[PDB]
Amino acid sequence: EKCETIHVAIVCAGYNASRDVVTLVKSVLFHRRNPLHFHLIADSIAEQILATLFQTWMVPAVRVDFYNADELKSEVSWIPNKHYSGIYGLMKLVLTKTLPANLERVIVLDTDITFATDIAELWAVFHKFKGQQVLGLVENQSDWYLGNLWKNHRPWPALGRGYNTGVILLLLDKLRKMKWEQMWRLTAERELMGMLSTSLADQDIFNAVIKQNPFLVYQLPCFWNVQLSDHTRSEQCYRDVSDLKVIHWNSPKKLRVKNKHVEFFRNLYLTFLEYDGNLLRRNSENLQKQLSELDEDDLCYEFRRERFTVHRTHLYFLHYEYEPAADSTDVTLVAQLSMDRLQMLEAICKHWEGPISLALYLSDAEAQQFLRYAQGSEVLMSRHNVGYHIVYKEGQFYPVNLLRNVAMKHISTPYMFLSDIDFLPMYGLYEYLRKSVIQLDLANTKKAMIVPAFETLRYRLSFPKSKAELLSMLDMGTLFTFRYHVWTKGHAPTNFAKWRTATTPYRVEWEADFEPYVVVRRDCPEYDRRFVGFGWNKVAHIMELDVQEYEFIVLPNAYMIHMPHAPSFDITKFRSNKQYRICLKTLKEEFQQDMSRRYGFAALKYLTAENNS
Amino acid sequence: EKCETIHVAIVCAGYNASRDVVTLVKSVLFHRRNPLHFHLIADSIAEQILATLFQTWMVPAVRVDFYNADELKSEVSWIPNKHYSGIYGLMKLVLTKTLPANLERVIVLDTDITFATDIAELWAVFHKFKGQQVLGLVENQSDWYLGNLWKNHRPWPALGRGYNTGVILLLLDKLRKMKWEQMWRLTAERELMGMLSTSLADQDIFNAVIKQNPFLVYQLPCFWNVQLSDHTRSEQCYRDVSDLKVIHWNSPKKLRVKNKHVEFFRNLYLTFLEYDGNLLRRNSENLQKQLSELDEDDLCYEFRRERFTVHRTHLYFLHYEYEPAADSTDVTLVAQLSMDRLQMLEAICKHWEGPISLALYLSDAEAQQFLRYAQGSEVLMSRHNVGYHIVYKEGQFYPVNLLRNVAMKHISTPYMFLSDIDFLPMYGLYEYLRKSVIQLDLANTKKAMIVPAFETLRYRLSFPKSKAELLSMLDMGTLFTFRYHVWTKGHAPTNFAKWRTATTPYRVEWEADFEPYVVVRRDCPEYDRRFVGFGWNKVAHIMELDVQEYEFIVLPNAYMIHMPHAPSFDITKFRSNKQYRICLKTLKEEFQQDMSRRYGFAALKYLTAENNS
Ligand SMILES: [Mn+2]
Ligand SMILES: [Mn+2]
Ligand SMILES: [Mn+2]
Ligand SMILES: [Mn+2]
């Protein structure tokens, strides 16, 4: 009917799979022509990642339904397995019970597949099933089951070379009809009485129920999944580029394998592993209705256009693991960055010790480059507790607030710290703020902690170690208060003069254009989307913290030393475009009046200050 | 007939059209199934750009043939024109005179089209013509020809709304048998006596050729040429997404046109242009049979493969121009730059008055980012004499020598200066180099000039004026010799102590690891490709240029000072693994041996040095 709403099922388990299903879905969608409907069996972490990802793509004619695996985990718990994927591999057979009875046919695909062609043609194979051919599989393209690869090998019984369950084409309705659960269960225990465990997890069990009843299978043509292993024989299963339709990269080495034409296959792989998904995307009604009233005649309307724009967010790109402590007083950094500021990560990785978040902002190709880089550095790899929240590129402006609030919402500790990637904290600051949070006891009251700012110009500076050493180095003064020659009010209002002699934190009121760096509990407000780029950005958040009656505490025994960095493009554009400035000022008026409306008299002070200045 | 052949013809003229032709070509190829054969009616400049572009793509099943336009410019010169394209617009009318009778039918697309579907489908309409209908066309979507858009409008006579020449589908074989040449010439002569000149150039005349014989034309489907302008009713001519196959941009605004659903058109415009064209590759056999015997087990397999590679080069990305001078001594810088370091491009431009030829290294998607940036900054626009040679990304290493060579060969003056964009010359270095070239009289001999290298470690410094002031800052301790803390041997042989008191140029011999910056004639040897990446990318060229009996001169009254910069991944990979260092060393002995072999005893000198060290 040209629109049958093709149905798919994918097993996701672990962060690696969570991030490989992205590539598989890219491959399927690239050649799509009719509506799709996925069905991802996911654990909690994969559930969150993929929920956010798909809810952010805004794909058309595509739907996503997530099925819990924790409840269905026990079903196969009695089947020992040895596959590197884990116990989640076997579960690809319980789909009949898990999926709804109202569905008929699903292309069960493993994560690593990649389709070079539309899945419509593969779906078409559902018009060639005859007799009691209810499953759909392909002949194995290896010698694993033949029992001749090496001496003393005892593969589980199978028909000829065996089959690889990379792609399965099912008739759910039928399997439900003829009592599918019990016979495969019976075969399962029947084939486990003699030996220890399976060798390929689900792939093994299916082969059993393939061998015992050979009238269910349907020997699809070999070129539906060109299995590539260390002993591949796909050369006879393809002749040219056009014939290939689908690939399976079954190897622990993955991309390090060697073949006669591995170059072309790898090039194709990178074609879609690097394709700009933000282009494939062609909640919706409200979004479009907001887009309706939008006017193109405003000075900086584009700020309004970008205020509510939705960007593809792929949360937790790389592995992440964290065990919360009993104290319940942890802190985690957050920061935006792009290419120009990557190098600082190592430095920050050499500074922090606890978890940090990061709203890393790159295109797809730069995202893969970062993947390689983070897979290279030993310091990054050894650090488990560093999240990597990716927000892909789109539009022209820089949605910095979007990046920082995306990093805000997803944190695994109660309190948090706001900064930028440039700043480099102390050594041991993690324990310092641990003790400080414990002592000031913010678990009850409402307070903010500020770490003062600075800036130096000695690239090869020895890392200071003690407050008294900073006193000596300021008496000599090699580095100065951050932005001491452009924006004195940025951090001068901290009144550094009294900082020196202090031994305990001191409170400070608000001042014109006061934009410190704060530590605060998670409840602190998100940023205002109206402002994208550089300029008058943090001070909005500061205004909200202040107007919520947050007392500003400045920590005595900490500080930050800006590591010099090259100028970026946002600052140059801000300093060059006057229209940017005037529309920023009108946005200032708008924000101030909205603040007044939402709180009332208390917010008038800012206005009065603007009237006084 | 199952990939019989697809033929196409494109008119190219002026620098502003090469980019358009490349985007159109990638758009067409994105949906290809059959082999393709392009005929580019091109001028000298377009010929020069596109020859190398297509010779470097290495696309399969594609043949490119260039037809000169300078010889055939006069054929239509007698026909006045007012279209923004110019005289070349009429060139679409005399293809039969150009294209040999060996061909019978060929599409003709203006450079701005962007097919959204396979061109084979369009080619299919060459079996649906009846009798004598040779020329195929589509209806104009405007009301220009109807003479009702505005008062006092007198467009050339036409049938109905008129037809647009955006896409032409010819049947040349009949069009020659009809004596088309005399017919259109007479029609034009008749239609030029009364009015002043043509309005739409070729589209203004073809329509008349239709009217005077209404039964030639084939009225194609309207949804082929969806012209987008200020007076379009295409919403009637297009219904859905599947109702779109080929788009045109018929307004000087181009990117700044407005429509009801323009969002999808903009998406369809960025969908192909954004594509990384290096993934479309699915003089050649030589490359294959060198790649054949690259031992995978060899420690330099990746290096060996990389060196022979060919990269997509798009010479003269932006407008270029140069008025030759009678001095015949002009110099032109060269540099290798990437986007992680693009920021200081203006920096070099403020310090150069004469022509300079860069060599960027960009990603297509972000190549357009660079296009926008260059079109924004007024400093670059003010200067017409700057080249921009983009060699797109490919692979993992950094073929810097490729960038340098691409900038070497294509230079409009006989003399050149080699440096890096990460450096910076004095004010007036161009004039001083001119004087030195005309004075030392290098017009005959094989000598080179060297400009000394320093470095600074503070972002914000004033720009010196004279040599005395330079040495003043130097002795203040704010400046040092370039690489005076890691690689001292790079520039030490210049023994700046001697230069300080210098008043006339002085010669020097070679020293260990001596890597100056040279000003040289254009015959100096190409950079050795065997070394790729960062590190020992230049001293090899120096030892190549020294063994060849080139004397060295160090200019007394010139300098050039380094501006601090952050690191990149190339240095990280240079310090990452020992295998890279081992392969580097292997390439080292190979270079020594081969340079000896080609020159012999003279080489032993360098060898002896490495024996001593
Ligand atoms: Mn597998
Ligand atoms: Mn900064
Ligand atoms: Mn046009
Ligand atoms: Mn450098």
Secondary structure of A319-330 as H, E, C letters: CCCCCCCCCCCC
Place of tokens 């087990």: B297
For residues A429 and A559, give the distance between their C-alpha atoms in angstroms, rounded to a whole number: 9
For residues A23 and A272, give the distance between their C-alpha atoms in angstroms, rounded to a whole number: 7
Question: Across-strand partners of A337?
Answer: A360
Would you say A111 and A12 are in contact if contact means Cβ atoms under 8 Å apart?
yes
**Identity (one letter) of the amino acid at B425?**
P
- In A354-453, which ranges are E strands? 359-360, 390-391, 415-417, 447-450
A258 closest CB neighbour out of B274, B296, B459: B296
Would you say A560 and A419 are in contact if contact means Cβ atoms under 8 Å apart?
yes
Question: Across-strand partners of A36?
Answer: A6, A62
Place of tokens 């924790």: A70
For residues B35 and B8, give the distance between their C-alpha atoms in angstroms, rounded to a whole number: 11
For residues A547 and A179, give the distance between their C-alpha atoms in angstroms, rounded to a whole number: 66
| The CA-based dihedral angle spanning residues A160, A164, A165, A168, taken in that order and rounded to the nearest 10 degrees | -70
Query: Burial letters for B485-497: b for 16+ Cβ neighbours within 10 Å, e otherwise?
Result: eeeeebbbbbebe
**Identity (one letter) of the amino acid at A408?**
M
For residues A479 and A458, give the distance between their C-alpha atoms in angstroms, rounded to a whole number: 8
Q: Helix crossing, A578-599 with A604-612: angle to 10°?
A: 140
A267 contact residues in B (CB cutoff 8 A): 279, 281-282
- A365 CB near a chain B CB, below 8 Å? yes
Whether residue A594 is annotated as binding a ligand: the answer is no
For residues A24 and A22, give the distance between their C-alpha atoms in angstroms, rounded to a whole number: 5
Solved with? cryo-EM
Structure tokens that stand for A102 in this block: 């109202």
How many Cβ contacts (< 8 angstroms) between chains A and B?
A: 56
B281 contact residues in A (CB cutoff 8 A): 267
A457 contact residues in B (CB cutoff 8 A): 457-459
Would you say B561 and B455 are in contact if contact means Cβ atoms under 8 Å apart?
yes
Question: Closest Cα partner for A398 from A593, A502, A532, A286?
Answer: A532
For residues B17 and A489, give the distance between their C-alpha atoms in angstroms, rounded to a whole number: 51
Structure tokens that stand for A458 in this block: 């000695």
Segment B98-103 long-range contacts (CB within 8 Å, at least 24 positions apart): B98/B41, B98/B67, B98/B72, B99/B9, B99/B39, B99/B67, B99/B172, B101/B172, B101/B176, B103/B7, B103/B172
Which residue of A238, A255, A276, A337 to mutate against B (max B Cβ within 10 Å)? A276
**Cβ–Cβ gap A566/B267 under 8 Å:** no
- A243 CB near a chain B CB, below 8 Å? no
A566 closest CB neighbour out of B264, B271, B565: B565
The size of chain A, in residues, is: 613
Place of tokens 């196959």: B245
User: Can you spell out the DSSP letters for B312-374?
Assistant: -EES--S-------TT-----EE----GGGGGGHHHHHHH--S-EE--B---HHHHHHHHHHH
Q: Return the half-sphere exposure (C-beta side, CA atoms, 13 A cut-off) of residue A352.
A: 25
Q: What are φ and ψ of residue A66, in 5° steps?
A: -100, 135
For residues B502 and B555, give the distance between their C-alpha atoms in angstroms, rounded to a whole number: 9
Resolution (A): 3.4
B457 closest CB neighbour out of A340, A459, A565: A459
Would you say A397 and A303 are in contact if contact means Cβ atoms under 8 Å apart?
yes
Q: Residue B520, SS3?
A: strand
Q: What are φ and ψ of residue B562, in 5° steps?
A: -80, 140
User: Helix, strand, coil: what percent of chain B each, to 5?
Assistant: 40, 15, 50
Question: Closest Cα partner for B389 from B492, B314, B489, B481?
Answer: B314
Alpha-carbon separation of residue B597 from A570, B590, B602 (angstroms) = 54, 10, 10
CB B116: neighbour CB atoms within 10 A?
18
Structure tokens that stand for B398 in this block: 């950094």
Structure tokens that stand for A275 in this block: 């394709």
For residues B356 and B385, give the distance between their C-alpha atoms in angstroms, rounded to a whole number: 7
Q: What are φ and ψ of residue A53, in 5° steps?
A: -60, -55
**Cβ–Cβ gap A373/B569 under 8 Å:** yes
Alpha-carbon separation of residue B168 from A14, B98, B110, B267 (angstroms) = 55, 16, 9, 25
- B86 CB near a chain A CB, below 8 Å? no
For residues A212 and A197, give the distance between their C-alpha atoms in angstroms, rounded to a whole number: 19
For residues A539 and A576, give the distance between their C-alpha atoms in angstroms, rounded to a whole number: 21
Question: B203 alpha carbon to ligand 3 midpoint, in Å?
Answer: 9
Structure tokens that stand for B175 in this block: 């069009």
For residues B452 and B497, give the distance between their C-alpha atoms in angstroms, rounded to a whole number: 12
**Cβ–Cβ gap A564/B459 under 8 Å:** yes
Residue of B nearest to A395 (CA): B369
Q: Which residues contact B525 (CB under 8 A, 6 or more apart)?
A: B541, B544, B545, B548
For residues A315 and A336, give the distance between their C-alpha atoms in angstroms, rounded to a whole number: 14
Question: A84 alpha carbon to ligand 1 midpoint, in Å?
Answer: 10
Question: B568 alpha carbon to ligand 4 midpoint, in Å?
Answer: 10
For residues B228 and B237, give the distance between their C-alpha atoms in angstroms, rounded to a whole number: 12
Q: How far apart are the first and last CA of chain A?
A: 69
Question: B283 alpha carbon to ligand 1 midpoint, in Å?
Answer: 40
| The CA-based dihedral angle spanning residues A268, A274, A278, A283, taken in that order and rounded to the nearest 10 degrees | 90
CA distance A345 to chain B (A): 13
Q: What are φ and ψ of residue B30, in 5° steps?
A: -65, -25
Phi-psi region of B81 (alpha: psi -120 to 50; beta: other; left: phi over 0): beta
Using only C-alpha atoms, chain A has a radius of gyration, in whole angstroms, of: 29
- B576 CB near a chain A CB, below 8 Å? yes
Bind-site residues of B for Mn(2+): 110, 112, 420, 422
User: Dihedral of CA A203/A207/A210/A212: which sign?
Assistant: negative
- B279 CB near a chain A CB, below 8 Å? yes
Question: A229 alpha carbon to ligand 1 midpoint, in Å?
Answer: 10
- In B522-561, which ranges are E strands? 551-554
- C-alpha triplet A137, A142, A146: angle, nearest 5°: 100
Would you say A136 and A168 are in contact if contact means Cβ atoms under 8 Å apart?
yes
User: Can you spell out the DSSP letters for A74-143?
Assistant: GGGTTS----TT-GGGGGGGTHHHHS-TT----EEE-TT-EESS-HHHHHHGGGS--TT----EEB--SS
Question: Closest Cα partner for A204 from A376, A318, A82, A326?
Answer: A82
Breaks in chain A (C to N over 2.5 Å), named by the residue before each, are: 282
For residues A302 and A508, give the distance between their C-alpha atoms in angstroms, rounded to a whole number: 36
Structure tokens that stand for A25 in this block: 């879905």
Breaks in chain B (C to N over 2.5 Å), named by the residue before each, are: 282
Q: Which residues contact B324 (CB under 8 A, 6 or more apart)?
A: B412
* Strand-pair category, A167-169 with A62-68: unpaired
Residue of A nearest to B394 (CA): A267
Question: A380 alpha carbon to ligand 1 midpoint, in Å?
Answer: 28
Alpha-carbon separation of residue B258 from A137, B227, B250 (angstroms) = 51, 12, 12
What single DSSP character describes residue B37?
E
For residues A6 and A123, give the distance between their C-alpha atoms in angstroms, rounded to a whole number: 7
Place of tokens 């920061």: A335
- Write out the H or E segment, with its range, that includes residue B432: helix B429-440
A200 exposure class (CB count in 10 Å sphere: 0-12, 13-18, 19+): buried
For residues B215 and B204, give the distance between their C-alpha atoms in angstroms, rounded to a whole number: 18
- Write out the H or E segment, with its range, that includes residue B87: none
**Cβ–Cβ gap A279/B270 under 8 Å:** yes
Question: A564 alpha carbon to ligand 2 midpoint, in Å?
Answer: 7
A457 closest CB neighbour out of B274, B366, B459: B459
A403 exposure class (CB count in 10 Å sphere: 0-12, 13-18, 19+): buried
B264 contact residues in A (CB cutoff 8 A): 282
Whether residue A422 is annotated as binding a ligand: the answer is yes
- B378 CB near a chain A CB, below 8 Å? no
- B459 CB near a chain A CB, below 8 Å? yes
User: Can you spell out the DSSP letters for A331-344?
Assistant: --B--EE-GGGTTH
Would you say A492 and A514 are in contact if contact means Cβ atoms under 8 Å apart?
no
* Strand-pair category, A114-115 with A246-248: antiparallel
- A480 CB near a chain B CB, below 8 Å? no
Structure tokens that stand for A336 in this block: 């935006």
What single DSSP character describes residue B17?
G
For residues A91 and A586, give the distance between their C-alpha atoms in angstroms, rounded to a whole number: 58
Helix and strand tally (H, E) in chain A? 21, 19
- In B76-158, which ranges are E strands? 107-109, 114-115, 136-139
**Cβ–Cβ gap B274/A274 under 8 Å:** no
Alpha-carbon separation of residue A410 from A335, A483, A525 (angstroms) = 13, 31, 14
CA distance A421 to chain B (A): 15
Q: Residue A170, SS3?
A: coil
CB B460: neighbour CB atoms within 10 A?
6
A343 contact residues in B (CB cutoff 8 A): 566-567
Segment A54-61 long-range contacts (CB within 8 Å, at least 24 positions apart): A55/A283, A56/A310, A56/A311, A56/A312, A56/A313, A57/A277, A57/A281, A57/A312, A58/A281, A58/A283, A58/A284, A58/A287, A58/A310, A59/A29, A59/A280, A59/A281, A60/A281, A60/A282, A61/A34, A61/A35, A61/A36
For residues B205 and B218, give the distance between their C-alpha atoms in angstroms, rounded to a whole number: 17
Structure tokens that stand for B517 in this block: 């910056």
A99 exposure class (CB count in 10 Å sphere: 0-12, 13-18, 19+): buried
B597 exposure class (CB count in 10 Å sphere: 0-12, 13-18, 19+): exposed
Whether residue A110 is annotated as binding a ligand: the answer is yes
Would you say A66 and A51 are in contact if contact means Cβ atoms under 8 Å apart?
yes
**Cβ–Cβ gap A564/B366 under 8 Å:** no
- B270 CB near a chain A CB, below 8 Å? yes
**Cβ–Cβ gap B564/A567 under 8 Å:** no
Question: Closest Cα partner for A115 from A191, A27, A232, A35?
Answer: A27
Query: Burial letters for B412-437: b for 16+ Cβ neighbours within 10 Å, e otherwise?
Result: ebbbbbbbbbbbbbbeebbebbbebb
- C-alpha triplet B201, B207, B208: angle, nearest 5°: 95
Question: A567 alpha carbon to ligand 2 midpoint, in Å?
Answer: 7
- B256 CB near a chain A CB, below 8 Å? no
For residues A204 and B294, give the distance between their C-alpha atoms in angstroms, rounded to a whole number: 40
For residues B108 and B170, give the distance between their C-alpha atoms in angstroms, rounded to a whole number: 8
Distance of CA B532 to the CA centre of its chain: 22
CA distance A453 to chain B (A): 19
B457 contact residues in A (CB cutoff 8 A): 457-459
Question: Closest Cα partner for B532 from B275, B315, B309?
Answer: B309
Q: Which residues contact A304 (CB under 8 A, 6 or more apart)?
A: A294, A298, A530
- B16 CB near a chain A CB, below 8 Å? no
CA distance B163 to chain A (A): 31
For residues B209 and B148, give the distance between their C-alpha atoms in angstroms, rounded to a whole number: 22
Alpha-carbon separation of residue A596 from A401, A551, A582, A591, B313 (angstroms) = 22, 20, 21, 9, 57
